[PDB]
Design a binder for these strands. Structure first.
Ligand code: MG
Ligand code: MG
Ligand code: MG
Ligand code: MG
Ligand code: MG
Ligand code: MG
Ligand code: MG
Ligand code: MG
Ligand code: MG
Ligand code: MG
Ligand code: MG
Ligand code: MG
Ligand code: MG
Ligand code: MG
Ligand code: MG
Ligand code: MG
Ligand code: MG
Ligand code: MG
Ligand code: MG
Ligand code: MG
Ligand code: MG
Ligand code: MG
Ligand code: MG
Ligand code: MG
Ligand code: MG
Ligand code: MG
Ligand code: MG
Ligand code: MG
Ligand code: MG
Ligand code: MG
Ligand code: MG
Ligand code: MG
Ligand code: MG
Ligand code: MG
Ligand code: MG
Ligand code: MG
Ligand code: MG
Ligand code: MG
Ligand code: MG
Ligand code: MG
Ligand code: MG
Ligand code: MG
Ligand code: MG
Ligand code: MG
Ligand code: MG
Ligand code: MG
Ligand code: MG
Ligand code: MG
Ligand code: MG
Ligand code: MG
Ligand code: MG
Ligand code: MG
Ligand code: MG
Ligand code: MG
Ligand code: MG
Ligand code: MG
Ligand code: MG
Ligand code: MG
Ligand code: MG
Ligand code: MG
Ligand code: MG
Ligand code: MG
Ligand code: MG
Ligand code: MG
Ligand code: MG
Ligand code: MG
Ligand code: MG
Ligand code: MG
Ligand code: MG
Ligand code: MG
Ligand code: MG
Ligand code: MG
Ligand code: MG
Ligand code: MG
Ligand code: MG
Ligand code: MG
Ligand code: MG
Ligand code: MG
Ligand code: MG
Ligand code: MG
Ligand code: MG
Ligand code: MG
Ligand code: MG
Ligand code: MG
Length: 75
RNA sequence: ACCCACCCGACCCGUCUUGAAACACGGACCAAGGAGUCUAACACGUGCGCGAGUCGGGGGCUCGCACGAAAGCCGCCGUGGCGCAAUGAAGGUGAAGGCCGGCGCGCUCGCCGGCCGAGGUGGGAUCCCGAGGCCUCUCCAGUCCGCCGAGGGCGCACCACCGGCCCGUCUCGCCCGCCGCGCCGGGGAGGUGGAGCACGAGCGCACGUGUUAGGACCCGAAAGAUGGUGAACUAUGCCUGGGCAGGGCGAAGCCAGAGGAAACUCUGGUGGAGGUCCGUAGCGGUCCUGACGUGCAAAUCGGUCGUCCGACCUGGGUAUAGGGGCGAAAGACUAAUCGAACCAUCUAGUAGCUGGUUCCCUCCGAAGUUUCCCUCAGGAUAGCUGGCGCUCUCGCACACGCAGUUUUAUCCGGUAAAGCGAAUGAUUAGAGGUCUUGGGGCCGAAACGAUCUCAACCUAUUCUCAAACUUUAAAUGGGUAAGAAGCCCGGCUCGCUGGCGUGAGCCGGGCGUGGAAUGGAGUGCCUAGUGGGCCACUUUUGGUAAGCAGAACUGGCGCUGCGGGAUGAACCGAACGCCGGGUUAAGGCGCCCGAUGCCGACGCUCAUCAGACCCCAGAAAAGGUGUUGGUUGAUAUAGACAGCAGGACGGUGGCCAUGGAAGUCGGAAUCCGCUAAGGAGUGUGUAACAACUCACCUGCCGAAUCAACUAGCCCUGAAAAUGGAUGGCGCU
RNA sequence: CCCCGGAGCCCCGCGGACGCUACGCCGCGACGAGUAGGAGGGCCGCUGCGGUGAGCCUUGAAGCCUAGGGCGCGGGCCCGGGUGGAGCCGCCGCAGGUGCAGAUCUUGGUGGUAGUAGCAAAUAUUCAAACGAGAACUUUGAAGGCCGAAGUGGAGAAGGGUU
RNA sequence: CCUCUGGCAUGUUGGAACAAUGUAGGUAAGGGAAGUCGGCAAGCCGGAUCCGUAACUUCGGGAUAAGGAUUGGCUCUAAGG
RNA sequence: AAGCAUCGCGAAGGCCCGCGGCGGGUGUUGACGCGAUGUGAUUUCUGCCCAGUGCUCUGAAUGUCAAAGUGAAGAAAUUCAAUGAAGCGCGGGUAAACGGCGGGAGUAACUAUGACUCUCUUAAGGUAGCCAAAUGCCUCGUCAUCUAAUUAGUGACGCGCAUGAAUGGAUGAACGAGAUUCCCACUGUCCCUACCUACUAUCCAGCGAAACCACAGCCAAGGGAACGGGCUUGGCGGAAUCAGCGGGGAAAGAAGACCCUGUUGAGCUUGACUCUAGUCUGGCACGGUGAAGAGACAUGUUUUUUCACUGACCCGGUGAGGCGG
RNA sequence: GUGCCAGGUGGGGAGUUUGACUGGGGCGGUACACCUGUCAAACGGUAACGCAGGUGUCCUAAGGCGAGCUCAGGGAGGACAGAAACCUCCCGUGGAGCAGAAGGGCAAAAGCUCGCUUGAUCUUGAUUUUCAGUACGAAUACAGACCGUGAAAGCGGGGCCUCACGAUCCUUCUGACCUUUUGGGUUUUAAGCAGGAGGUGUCAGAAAAGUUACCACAGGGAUAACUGGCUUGUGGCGGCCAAGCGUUCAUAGCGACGUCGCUUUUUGAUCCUUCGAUGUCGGCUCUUCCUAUCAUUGUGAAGCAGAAUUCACCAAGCGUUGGAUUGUUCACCCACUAAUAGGGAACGUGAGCUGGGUUUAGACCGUCGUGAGACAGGUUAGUUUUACCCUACUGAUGAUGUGUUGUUGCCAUGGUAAUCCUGCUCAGUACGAGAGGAACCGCAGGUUCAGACAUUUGGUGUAUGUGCUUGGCUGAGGAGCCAAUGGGGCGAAGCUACCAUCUGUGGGAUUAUGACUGAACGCCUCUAAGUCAGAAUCCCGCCCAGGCGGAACGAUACGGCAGCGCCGC
């Protein structure tokens, strides 16, 4: 009582019926697999980004003043 | 709508199957019954009520119950279920930070008073501001009905990510507090595991589907256990009764006679014994494998048979009862039942195994494949499929993304091919070189002294190869990029790295058609069936081959009708709601049979086995002056080809062959003379000869001929059994 | 520079269907195969129940037959005629023991076979009369036979129970 | 096998013809197993009287071995109380 | 089956039944008996082997050896050590128990073979007999004979795939509904068939079923699921029937018995896996009294060896009839 | 002895098991867990009991660093020493070695030799590989420590890379000032967490011997034994070439080394139909068909002088025997014959027969197995079921049209039939040295078959015709009867036998073949046009049946009612 062992006959048709997809590419991909010391220290950098907010806001205000002087000299 | 007639079509329904009209199974016909139900646990989706709550279970109070064993109500309105908090094996622990100021060295750490109060980035349906444009019967001013709104936002749900917090576990270190200053308790930073939190969503009832446990869609076993009933049949033991003609052989014992000496021996009788013989009744059943074999009969009849005084037959009573009995032993008998009787119950035992499964229409619609399983007739899991939806975009003047597609650049191969004068392996033959020895060898006592030979040597050559060889090396393919998730700037953070620097992450700002054509896309639940396949173009394995077994891409049949191939799974065309007109595909147009009933074109073909359209149903090597063409080489006026006609002599019995070659079984040889001409010869045939007889030319007829290959059609090769098939008639 | 209780118009900003069971009506475009299977609609069918039709019915209910008229693609349904004699149906909802062509299906009935196979084991019957509507089978008489005293004879037991 | 006493109507029916193939009996010239797996079936012999009876043997048998002759009727004779 | 030969048992026994008991069968019995076997009359013979599997004998000369008990540690549960019954191991016997009876080398004045000697796995290596058997693949072995012809029959040979001595060998009178071969007579078994008889079958008066049945029924070829009554192309086909007939309906008869599958059974066997009745042995209780004797610890405790009594308990007899001084 | 424990024995008895894949199943193998090269069609993936193989190990170094060298082989040299012992020089892309099978990789290495060592250590995750994107095993970068090596860069958490291995539960060990041991406290113990081990080779993992011929059940043509189907290796048969055999001479007859085809009359191969059954081998009987022709008819070629015998064609019309043995299919033998040719039809033929041997159940022997039992080993005895249905066929009534009937006939169509041998003359002739030895036409007849028939003969016989008889019965004689037809003789009629007898046919077309005339091809030629002879072939005549076929002729309803046919309309 022998039988048929293995084939791939109707399989490509079955696979292309439901539309073989590219994987779900998303913006801001995950960090699973990145090396742990560099994940550790980017976590420290994201922890200490809140330090220096007054310097960042003041320098952004001076950059707005610089763009205002530039558009005043241009217009 | 009843019957009949004609033309075309039309094999009998259900099922197992790759394939059914099947010489596969079920099936005379008709009426009635007849097969997916009910409870519980869940899961998902839907309908309703309430909502961080929900439900009244159970019970109690009202109505004596027609309607009722209904309904209404409850400091029981929550005892309790589920949810609202999870995580550890457990002791246990248990989900918030940020901004401003002050005190300690701001020491990224500890302690005090107010605020925001549940983080941030990107994509995000709706909404808000919205410059400006579009006007009116005329120019300005101008509150208003408006529409489109460039641009910017707070951003619902949801997704991706980065953060933050809770519990378990691990690493590095420090600080705080006391009723008992301890093997006390708590806290920090960073990894990692959880079914967690991150301003709830559940509860209760009802409906649909799916998975189960239950009889579980229905019918079905071979079985197992428990408790009983039978020895009227049969098996054996016991008790008490009944029965078994007539003949044959003649055991012991006994009598008499004869022969001899007793010893004894013969003869003639009598006698009636035998698990003795023929044979009746009785008992049983060898052979005809006779009769019958839907019988006289669920085991009989006829002839022929074995036995018939003892291991004989038989009635009644009685005893042995089922894993038991009993057996002159056959697993035989035990009530037509025996390799474990019968009746009832468990029991509607189980079955991956057969069969069947009951109304219509519409829409969508498969698989025989991956992996695992004592799995190969089956399940689970992915795949294929259906339903329920959600999130967005809009031919209403204004599209992000996606492909069995191509292009533009960029890489991958090691297959076809080709090569081995390149490597590895095989393998052919010459040529030149004492590389270097050796064996059969020849001249030599020997010598690399002359001749060559092969085993292994070299140098350039040459012939053929390789799925498990390869320098090369395609065609077809496989990934990528063709932008807003992209570039260009400015600045913070880092505990990584660090001569300064790098790298990564956060912010803020500026620039849009990112090659061709076509698409409206993304996503979450349940979820049946399937898990036996088969055929065909191309590639290919094993096999002599197969309508054989097994593979790769693709398409079909299965699941599919229709036109054609005469018939028909898979071939060609083409896919299907019911029709009318027209036009075709594939096939055809003498008749069957719709259409060439064209004054069709050009040739080939004669078959005493003609030939007639993929699959496909039949043919080969070889041969033919049968016939039609082509290729090559010759000769013909210096007077062809066949047709009547003169000849095969001499050196030469040349030369090995003695067993015979003056041509003669055969082989190295292989030219002159006469010359017009005979090749040291094509045959007839000889112990050898002799003889007959073929190149060349003349006398006669005077222009197309000869030879070898090769392609068409036809013929031989070519022989099977019922009468036989281009489908038939037939057709030149 | 006027209102349409009426400019009178291919549009009436004055109320605004004949067209609206909005679970309805209407207008374009594309498509239509199908087993196993899945989903939806049934104003398809059976039975019973709560409502509903001032429903039907001895001036004829259900059932059954029909060479009649029909409708729906279809499941099926509505009438016409005949039999029948006592209950029955439509709609909104609920519930189920709800649709048969098969299962060597269960029960019941009936065909072809078919007026067929068969009524053939043990030798054998024949003539006249009686009875009767009726004689091959009854009876009587006569003839010929068979069982042949281990019988086809005369009586018991087991068994049957009135034979 | 035939008859007497006793019993019966030929065994779930009869009539007409005498086809094949059957079932059960028989008979066949010549051959005698040549048929067939196989003398299967069928066929020969068979009672009694008088002779005669082998191999072998457990000395009992084999044995009715094998193989011959005779068998009727009528009329007598002899013997058997 | 008689004959033959074994095995066990002297009664608190052998074999066996029984859920059970001072239970029961043999047994109303006692080795000339009962129970379990093998072989199968008479004659003759029954060879060798105890290595294996069985069975059986004794043995503190003893490897393993459970429970109970003994000693040591601890707070104890617990652990350790010695002792350690029967049985398995060790050692004898046993084949009329199951059974087995092969190779190698040397060696005889022709060759060949081996009377003789040594060894193996494992213990001897087929003895007397017998045979191409009911037993022999080759094979239809070879020879003689029976025949015209013999794979048959009989008699011999042994090289015997794979004979063989109570898993009995050989012979053998009589007997056998046992199986084969030949001969005499005989016959339709046949050449080669023929005829007659009775009952059927045929027709008729009366009575009258059953199996089976998708629809039903004429063939050739093609294809098909690969042997068609139906499809296609041809041949063709004409009402209703009777008596036969065996070619077809892959005719009927029964869910193939053969072969396979099932994680379906049943009968049986054992060196399968778990168990169990019975049986043997050890410990505790029923279970008392005395005598001497050995061992261990140690300066009373334990293991105990046999004998004596009856008082528990068991057996036998009686009509419980004289038992002890 | 009893009651209760403990140990041995225990198929007497009980329950249960006896894997899977498989060109059917057992036996043989693992294609059952893995690894390499190929298959494999240039990403990956890809099957078979496809090919070559390998594995369940080994290593305290063969792991990890650092340093120095180059390996195999060849040439040249050197005392023993040669082809291989040891020393040196040169060439030396790896042609060696790296533990193993293979592939890849590697030259101041990944090889050899040294020096030091234990990264072959502990703890979180992530990823790859078979994959469902689950495990296990193996591997890949990292992270935190602690280390080794080196001067450092760095390298190393096993083997140069691809395999060398294993869930739940249970047990064992190790670790924490770890948790619980349920009223509280201590301790022993026990349970927990994590890591390692004890193993499931059927390798994602039951604990598992056989037999059944006494067998049973649910199924399968998913799967065999038969036949049918495809193929033809094999079996059988036929060609192509032509080195040779044949006194010379390849081809009269043969034919090596090679090669091309047919058949399903043999065995193979596959599993397409059948397991809710298709009766499984032989022999007997009987019919039809094929030719690959043994004989007969007609011919051609011979190493054909005659006889006899081989090769080849047309050709299946008619024949192909009786037996011993064996169940035989086959086989061999004896005899006859003209010759004793080969086959098919579900390996033709069991509702036709037989049952001989396969292939049930009972037995005996031999081998194997402890045993039950097995043995294409041998022997023995072993129930052969049904037609009355439809078709086909054999016979028989019939039927439709001819107005109805009868006589006489024709004919389409269908079947078909005759075959073979011996003796005499030819003729001891042709021929031949002889030995031997024909043929045509005639004459007489036989074999097989067919169709009849009973004068004779033989059989049958129940004219129950006639005698003779056994037993019984009617009183005896006579006459008879019964005894399933009493027996035995003879026997009428009728049936019947190659067991008696009679009869059995002629043409036409032509095949093969031999020819005529005569081209093509101014020659020749059976052929191309034409023409002749020509046979068991074919067809018809003879014979049998007579069509949903006709023809000619006769009579056609006087009756007690009637009714028909021709003619003019
Ligand atoms: Mg499969
Ligand atoms: Mg199936
Ligand atoms: Mg299917
Ligand atoms: Mg099939
Ligand atoms: Mg069908
Ligand atoms: Mg068929
Ligand atoms: Mg079936
Ligand atoms: Mg049927
Ligand atoms: Mg019904
Ligand atoms: Mg579910
Ligand atoms: Mg819900
Ligand atoms: Mg709960
Ligand atoms: Mg059921
Ligand atoms: Mg269910
Ligand atoms: Mg049941
Ligand atoms: Mg059981
Ligand atoms: Mg019998
Ligand atoms: Mg019989
Ligand atoms: Mg009959
Ligand atoms: Mg038996
Ligand atoms: Mg559809
Ligand atoms: Mg299965
Ligand atoms: Mg490759
Ligand atoms: Mg190539
Ligand atoms: Mg299946
Ligand atoms: Mg197949
Ligand atoms: Mg195409
Ligand atoms: Mg109900
Ligand atoms: Mg019905
Ligand atoms: Mg009748
Ligand atoms: Mg009768
Ligand atoms: Mg009486
Ligand atoms: Mg009588
Ligand atoms: Mg009678
Ligand atoms: Mg009568
Ligand atoms: Mg009677
Ligand atoms: Mg005779
Ligand atoms: Mg014979
Ligand atoms: Mg006889
Ligand atoms: Mg005798
Ligand atoms: Mg014995
Ligand atoms: Mg002995
Ligand atoms: Mg022994
Ligand atoms: Mg001997
Ligand atoms: Mg014989
Ligand atoms: Mg003999
Ligand atoms: Mg022996
Ligand atoms: Mg023996
Ligand atoms: Mg049919
Ligand atoms: Mg038939
Ligand atoms: Mg079956
Ligand atoms: Mg069955
Ligand atoms: Mg299975
Ligand atoms: Mg079971
Ligand atoms: Mg049983
Ligand atoms: Mg055991
Ligand atoms: Mg057992
Ligand atoms: Mg069992
Ligand atoms: Mg198997
Ligand atoms: Mg590829
Ligand atoms: Mg180095
Ligand atoms: Mg590290
Ligand atoms: Mg290494
Ligand atoms: Mg047997
Ligand atoms: Mg067998
Ligand atoms: Mg099959
Ligand atoms: Mg076959
Ligand atoms: Mg061949
Ligand atoms: Mg020659
Ligand atoms: Mg049948
Ligand atoms: Mg049949
Ligand atoms: Mg021929
Ligand atoms: Mg014969
Ligand atoms: Mg046959
Ligand atoms: Mg037949
Ligand atoms: Mg039969
Ligand atoms: Mg037989
Ligand atoms: Mg048998
Ligand atoms: Mg009849
Ligand atoms: Mg004719
Ligand atoms: Mg008289
Ligand atoms: Mg003629
Ligand atoms: Mg001619
Ligand atoms: Mg002529």
């Amino acid at each position: 009582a022998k039988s048929k062992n293995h084939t791939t006959h109707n399989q490509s048709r079955k696979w292309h019926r439901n539309g073989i997809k590219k994987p779900r590419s998303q913006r801001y991909e995950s960090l699973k697999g990145v090396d742990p010391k560099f994940l550790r220290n980017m976590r420290f950098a994201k922890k200490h980004n809140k330090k220096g907010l007054k310097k960042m806001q003041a320098n952004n205000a001076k950059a707005m003043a610089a763009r205002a002087e530039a558009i005043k000299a241009l217009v």
